[PDB]
Design a protein around this nucleic acid. Structure first.
Length: 50
DNA sequence: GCCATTTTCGCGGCTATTTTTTTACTCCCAAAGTTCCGCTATCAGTTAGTAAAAT
């Protein structure tokens, strides 16, 4: 189902794209797993801990 | 009087960061020591005035 969803959106079925180094413009030698993750900001902030 | 069994005694990791708790209830009086306001009186400091000196 995930691969079918990727194919519908015109994206690689492996979920890996070709990325380039922004510092040099050179392509990384291998495809990189790029996607979207739900990330959280936990209540452990360096402001309250320093 | 030694061999085993029951009874105490003391122990169980280190750094951080958030936050109080809460039942239970005699009264009166006389005698004594202490405090709080007001006044006095003295001393020391401050300030105003005037003469002494210097420009």
């Amino acid at each position: 189902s995930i691969k079918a969803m990727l194919e519908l959106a015109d994206l690689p079925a492996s979920g890996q794209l070709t990325l380039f180094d922004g510092r040099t413009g050179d392509a990384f030698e291998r495809p990189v797993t790029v996607g979207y993750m739900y990330m959280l900001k936990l209540n452990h902030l360096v402001d309250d801990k320093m």
